[PDB]
Amino acid sequence: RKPCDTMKVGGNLDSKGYGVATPKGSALGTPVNLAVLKLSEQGILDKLKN
Amino acid sequence: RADIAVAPLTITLVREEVIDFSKPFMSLGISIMIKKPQKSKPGVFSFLD
Amino acid sequence: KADIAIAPLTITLVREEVIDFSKPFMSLGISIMIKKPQKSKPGVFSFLD
Amino acid sequence: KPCDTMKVGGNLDSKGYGIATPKGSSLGAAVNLAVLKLAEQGALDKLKN
Amino acid sequence: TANLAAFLTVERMVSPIESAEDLAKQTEIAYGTLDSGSTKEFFRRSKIA
Amino acid sequence: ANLAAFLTVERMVSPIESAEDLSKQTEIAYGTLDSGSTKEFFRRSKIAV
Ligand SMILES: O=c1[nH]c2cc(C(F)(F)F)c(N3CCOCC3)cc2n(CP(=O)(O)O)c1=O
Numbered sequence: 001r002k003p004c005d006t007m008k009v010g011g012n013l014d015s016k017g018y019g020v021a022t023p024k025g026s027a028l029g030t031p032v033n034l035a036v037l038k039l040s041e042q043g044i045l046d047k048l049k050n
Numbered sequence: 051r052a053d054i055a056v057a058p059l060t061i062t063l064v065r066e067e068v069i070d071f072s073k074p075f076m077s078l079g080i081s082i083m084i085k086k087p088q089k090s091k092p093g094v095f096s097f098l099d
Numbered sequence: 100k101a102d103i104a105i106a107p108l109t110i111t112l113v114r115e116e117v118i119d120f121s122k123p124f125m126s127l128g129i130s131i132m133i134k135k136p137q138k139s140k141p142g143v144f145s146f147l148d
Numbered sequence: 149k150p151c152d153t154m155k156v157g158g159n160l161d162s163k164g165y166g167i168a169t170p171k172g173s174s175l176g177a178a179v180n181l182a183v184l185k186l187a188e189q190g191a192l193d194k195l196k197n
Numbered sequence: 198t199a200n201l202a203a204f205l206t207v208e209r210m211v212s213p214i215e216s217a218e219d220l221a222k223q224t225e226i227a228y229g230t231l232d233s234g235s236t237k238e239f240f241r242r243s244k245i246a
Numbered sequence: 247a248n249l250a251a252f253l254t255v256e257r258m259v260s261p262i263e264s265a266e267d268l269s270k271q272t273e274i275a276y277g278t279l280d281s282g283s284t285k286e287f288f289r290r291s292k293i294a295v
């Protein structure tokens with residue numbers, strides 16, 4: 001972002017990660033996770049990241 | 051009050067025991083932010099340095 | 100033939116369709132392996148280096 | 149050894165290893181909770197170092 | 198001549214910060230986090246010295 | 247002064263930094279393993295790089 005006056009140095013310090021939130025015992029959680037894995041293997045997450 | 055949530059929520063142990071999570075879509079870590087200094091080198095003023 | 104596998108096995112979609120997987124303990128990616136750049140003989144370019 | 153290579157650049161893709169269990173198993177959820185407990189305590193980073 | 202050589206010797210000195218051990222090795226450049234959250238709780242519940 | 251500066255520190259750097267540096271040149275070649283999902287990532291990629 002402007003004024004483009006910062007930069008990121010160093011590697012990641014811990015293993016953090018975000019995921020799709022669903023209630024416990026939900027029936028749609030397994031097809032949602034299959035869709036997440038399908039979008040991850042297709043690389044469309046990296047496309048939206050770019 | 052909700053049915054499903056798509057948001058950057060951190061997958062923790064204390065949150066897994068009440069609600070479930072799928073596999074993570076974006077891994078990340080703790081970063082370092084600096085002031086990003088540039089090469090502000092002047093001309094004639096740097097000769098008499 | 101086994102009960103549980105604790106080994107670096109790659110989490111894919113085609114492996115999810117038959118067995119289950121847990122949350123990732125260590126994230127990684129594809130990196131660049133090159134040798135360490137040592138000193139090279141510069142030659143004639145050291146006349147005005 | 150001979151300590152003659154080095155890695156540069158960030159990761160190009162999102163890869164991650166996890167514990168595998170067969171589908172319909174009873175131990176997969178306590179294994180996942182134990183993985184989350186080891187992740188939050190930083191013991192995985194300790195073994196990585 | 199010696200003074201300009203000393204200044205150019207200073208010009209090729211220590212690279213900027215690239216690791217947390219570089220932050221621990223100095224005291225001139227201070228740093229901070231957010232006042233509340235799991236980011237500060239990571240350093241509060243840390244075990245690495 | 248600058249020749250003393252080059253003869254003083256002698257901290258050589260690497261020519262290749264990012265993944266786009268491999269596409270930016272052609273003199274230094276690069277390859278992967280002959281079989282595997284790493285090669286399938288390059289085979290089924292959608293990025294023009
Ligand atoms: O579940 C959590 N998810 C979070 C997600 C994000 C974001 F990155 F925006 F998605 C952030 N920010 C990071 C820096 O910019 C401001 C907000 C904080 C989060 N926090 C607070 P923490 O406890 O300090 O981690 C959580 O608790």
Ligand SMILES: O=c1[nH]c2cc(C(F)(F)F)c(N3CCOCC3)cc2n(CP(=O)(O)O)c1=O
Nearest residue numbers: 106107108109110165279281282283284285286
């Ligand atoms: O499930 C898989 N797990 C794998 C685990 C490893 C590692 F853990 F690193 F040993 C490796 N190697 C990559 C680096 O050098 C040595 C072997 C390959 C794996 N492959 C083959 P891929 O399909 O090409 O990824 C898998 O299929």
